[PDB]
Write a protein that binds this ligand. Sequence first.
Ligand SMILES: *[C@@H]1O[C@H](CO)[C@@H](O)[C@H](O)[C@H]1NC(C)=O
Lengths: 97, 191
Amino acid sequence: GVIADYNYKLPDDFMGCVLAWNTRNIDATSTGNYNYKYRYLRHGKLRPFERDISNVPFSPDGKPCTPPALNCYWPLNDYGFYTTTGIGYQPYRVVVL
Amino acid sequence: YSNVTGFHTINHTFGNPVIPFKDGIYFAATEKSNVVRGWVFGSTMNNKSQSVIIINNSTNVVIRACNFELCDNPFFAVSKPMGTQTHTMIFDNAFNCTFEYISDAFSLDVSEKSGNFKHLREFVFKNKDGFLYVYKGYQPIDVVRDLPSGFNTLKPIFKLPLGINITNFRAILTAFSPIWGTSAAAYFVGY
Ligand SMILES: *[C@@H]1O[C@H](CO)[C@@H](O)[C@H](O)[C@H]1NC(C)=O
């Protein structure tokens, strides 16, 4: 979806463990921890096990952008962590082996 | 017997474009003066995305992954009459430095030679499961140009878990200044 092909991709053969715990009182705030972002936007997708922190403005459909032009925006989208939400909008912290 | 693009570095010809990595590459190095000494592997080739630089700075072998502010013409400058390297004009800035390697200390032949291309270095690069597979071969020859027909097994030297975005690359040459200039070398693309 958006995590693998845009933020960081994992291969489907060998993966270690997902160390995930509940940091509701650490990262979140009931108005919204709007201090963290994630990629939704790149000229294409990633290979397995690949970082991408490119703040070049891109296109959501892999289209080559010479900005300002068609579908040219910023690569990063908000999270919005509340302490007054369900688990789907609460932060966890994940360590991957 | 597949198509090999030859980029010659001759007197006015200083060829180091952004070359696609698409699935991996075969770097050949027809050398006599150790002109080609490095590469920059990235995708955006600027300070926004992560990129790795793999160089020999004639003292060490340095592998470093950061957000390098890539110089659009990265080069090492060697004084042609002095025989010494003068410049390290690689990047202006580096930040979010992800990987860092420096090899053992040595002293490399910096000087310009003449005659035929003395040594061939054969390099094969792959981005597989987020590793950076870097494989190596080496044998001596003596020829003027035209990458010779031959057979040599290449060996794994570095299984580099970088985990970065590599779709494009650029070789890092050496400019010989006696104000820029070259001497004769050539490198080869090898998809
Ligand atoms: C690739 O090599 C073949 C034979 O060696 C040749 O016919 C062909 O023209 C070469 N490709 C290019 C782009 O020149």
